[PDB]
Amino acid sequence: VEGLRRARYKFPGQQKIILSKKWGFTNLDRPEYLKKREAGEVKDDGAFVKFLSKKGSLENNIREFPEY
Amino acid sequence: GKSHGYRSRTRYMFQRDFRKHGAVHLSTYLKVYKVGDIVDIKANGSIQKGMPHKFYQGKTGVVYNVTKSSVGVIINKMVGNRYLEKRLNLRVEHIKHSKCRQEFLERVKANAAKRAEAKAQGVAVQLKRQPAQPRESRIVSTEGNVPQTLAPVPYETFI
Amino acid sequence: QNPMRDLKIEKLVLNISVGESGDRLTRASKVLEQLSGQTPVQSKARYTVRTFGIRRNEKIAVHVTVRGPKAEEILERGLKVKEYQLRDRNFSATGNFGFGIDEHIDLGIKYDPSIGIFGMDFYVVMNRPGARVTRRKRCKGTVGNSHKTTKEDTVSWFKQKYDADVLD
Amino acid sequence: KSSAYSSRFQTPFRRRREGKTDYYQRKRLVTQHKAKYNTPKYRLVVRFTNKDIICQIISSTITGDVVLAAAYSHELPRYGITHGLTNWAAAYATGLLIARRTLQKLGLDETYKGVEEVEGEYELTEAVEDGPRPFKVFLDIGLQRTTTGARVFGALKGASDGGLYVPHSENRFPGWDFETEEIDPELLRSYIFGGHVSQYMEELADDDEERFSELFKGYLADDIDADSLEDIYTSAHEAIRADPAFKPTEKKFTKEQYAAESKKYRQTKLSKEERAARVAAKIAAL
RNA sequence: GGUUGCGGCCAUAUCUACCAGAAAGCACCGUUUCCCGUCCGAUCAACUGUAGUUAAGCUGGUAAGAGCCUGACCGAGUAGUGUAGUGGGUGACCAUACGCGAAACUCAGGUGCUGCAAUCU
RNA sequence: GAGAACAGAAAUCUCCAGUAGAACAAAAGGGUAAAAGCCCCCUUGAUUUUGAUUUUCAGUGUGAAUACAAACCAUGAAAGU
RNA sequence: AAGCUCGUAUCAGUUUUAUGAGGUAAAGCGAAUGAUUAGAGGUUCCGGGGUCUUGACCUAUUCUCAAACUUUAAAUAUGUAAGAAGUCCUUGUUACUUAAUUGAACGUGGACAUUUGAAUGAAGAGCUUUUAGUGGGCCAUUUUUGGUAAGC
Ligand SMILES: [Mg+2]
Ligand SMILES: [Mg+2]
Ligand SMILES: [Mg+2]
Ligand SMILES: [Mg+2]
Ligand SMILES: [Mg+2]
Ligand SMILES: [Mg+2]
């Protein structure tokens, strides 16, 4: 927060510092991300993750997320 | 300098629809047009012959002449402070029948049927259209429909 | 279940790629006249390349296509040079195969010092009965997967007859 | 195939995907002069499948094409022709049959009697003075390639000789040599009555008995020699002009009986409830 | 209901991978004297329906399929926008009043219909 | 992409995939796949007579373009163009 | 300015109903084209160092954009129609057209009056001749181009 506050002096206009309720850089709320992870619906690929959908072929959705 | 060619500014107007390129379906050539029919003009980009000028795109006219592969259409054009009569020779690919009266001819048929039907029983056959009227009185019951109270919500960011 | 889906020879193409045109090509075109009994056709260069020494539309190469029982006869005499031995390569993923030779005198023709020595390219096209569906003008279609020609099918077919082997 | 490729793909017309209709020639075949209004243009459709010939008179409508008359090659047995239902001579006979059938239907069979003395001469059906002009159709060959001696033009000759006015030239008839711009009537007449087949039978008999036994098997079984096919074609032409009406084959069973038998050999779709069961069951196994 | 000829709308019809198909039809398939066309009867032409086969084409079914189509108080009355004030604000811009009103997203369902003629357990 | 003596990143030959990512004298934008692209065959309608119509517009001219009528021709089996 | 022909008559800087046309605002980039951040999993007899890395493409994702990009797509503006020059029944003309009294166009005679075909308004509508001045403009709200900006 202090690091972002010091960066405002380099910018014209007004900026606001907002504490996001999402988990990291994902578009999901913290309770939603925790629920998906415990159900084995989240797979790591690099710095981001991939989710499991109810659509598509079972042949592809079984080899991925074997825990689910 | 400026450019004012015949097909100027028609980059998107004369394009084909998405995934609708290619040959013209045969029902376009099987339709029959007669003098006095009301048609509307929409140019087809794949037929470069008998193509209307861009001004007449989306205009509606009356057929006055019939030829081998084309018809003659009359268009009223406003020039200055008065309208002038314009005559166009267009191939059938660029026109179609206007539905602005096909739903009016049926009302003409309906009026005659209703006028004759009530002739033997009741006067004041009432064959004039009316605009939407204000709603009449009604009773609304709360049986199984008890009103639910709503209040404004507080401000949140959720970003 | 193989009632009618037996592998068959479609055609055989004899290609001689000559760098230049003129007298050299005419002598090369003479070899194919009696080797196959048919008049060959010359192909022109698509675009010029300075390094290879050809120009656009120069009529550099020549080829001929043979079908019927005559195609097998030329293939058998052409396999005598290779001693009925091919590599694990030379077979395409579509079920076709081919090989090259350096001399045409060993096929049986005389030296004929008025002709010369030329190499030849052999390529054999394989298919099954019913391939007309992809060649007919009307109701053109595509061959089903089970009816397709496979690399493993051609090598097995090449082993049962000619009692040949395949290298590594 | 990537999803982007499939999304932006434009499928052609169904008849073009199946490779049955050429829409380039179809537009020019069916489009009528707009000052003639609802005057229909009639196509003489001639098609050649394996061991069958089909001839039809077809006009176009918004809802779909409408058949005016039809003539099938397999109807020739009731006119004396049993062998070679697809050769050049068969095409001429079914071309004559469709021509005489439509003239009777329109009530114009009395006029325009065609030609009763066929000799392989090129001529059109001229109109009669102070009377009705001949019925006019245009030849539709579909995807058939135009070559001189093809069977499609043989069916054209029969329609023209049957009283129908079909505009055509004689440069695609057998016997036309490209070096001299004239037709050879004597060779053209032979193809009318199977002259090419007769020459083959007599030559093949004295060259190879094995193939002459393999081919022309029906000729030997029914005792028709190489000089009998010419006269049966001649008798068939007179039989066509006598009773050109259409007679349908008697149906052994009713359409309802046919429908019931075909239902047992058709696989039915699955509704959503059991479709969900199949995937759910696969989850419990995998 | 199956099939063939000619179509209409032109993916609910396409694409990928598999399975199935009685009868008829279609098809593959056999031959090179003749008309005809090729380097090659492969394509095109002719002849036979005879010697063979449903292997493919073709048709239908299957897939928490891809695509496509339809609907939804799904998102959203959100973005945008017509009109109004001696409204807010240094400004950038924004709120309110009388009206109109998206797209993406999300979810659910669907996977050709049909006209003329002929023919078939 | 997978293959074939010399032969290689690029010579010629074969198959498969390929909605146009090519080509269509030129600037750019439209348009086009049994074609409007490529190759082959035959041709001169790039012809004759005089009007009507569209664009710029004063509803003048000039340029260009559109649909017919009356002739004579080209091409194709033909519808047609 | 002079009038002229007529007078319930059609019209309207308007709405409504039915039916067309458009590619701007917005939106979109795990949709095409063109830009653009970051890793991850794969691919080579087909880049180069080193006995294993860095570049290349492949596949599934991720961040951010377009006056001369786009599937989708408003609001405001915009074309036509809402009857007597209408509808229906019967049958006459022609050198056009049709295989054909088939059709096309124009007519004879018959049937249906102004709740006769939505709303509101209408110092009445239609028409002609002739001639003056003018042909340097400027300002405000909103949209908008060049320019740091300007009472530009
Ligand atoms: Mg032109
Ligand atoms: Mg053609
Ligand atoms: Mg004010
Ligand atoms: Mg624009
Ligand atoms: Mg924008
Ligand atoms: Mg002045």
Numbering used by the authors:
A (entry chain LN): 149 to 216
B (entry chain QT): 2 to 160
C (entry chain LO): 6 to 173
D (entry chain LI): 8 to 293
Quoted passage from the original study:
In this study, we investigated the expression pattern, structure within the ribosome and effect on protein synthesis of the ribosomal protein paralog 39L (RPL39L).
Mouse RPL39 and RPL39L both integrate into yeast 60S subunits when expressed in the rpl39Δ background. Mouse RPL39, adopted a structure that was highly similar to that of RPL39 (RMSD = 0.482 Å) in the WT yeast ribosomes. While mouse and yeast RPL39 occupy virtually identical positions in the ribosome exit tunnel, RPL39L was found in two distinct conformations, one very similar and the other distinct from RPL39. The comparison of rpl39Δ-MmRPL39 and rpl39Δ-MmRPL39L maps shows that the amino acids S2 in RPL39 and A2 in RPL39L are found at the same position, deeply embedded in rRNA 1490–1493, where they serve a structural role. We replicated these phenotypes in two distinct yeast RPL39 KO clones and further showed that they are rescued by the introduction of yRPL39 (rpl39Δ-ScRPL39 clones), mouse RPL39 (rpl39Δ-MmRPL39 clones) and mouse RPL39L (rpl39Δ-MmRPL39L clones).
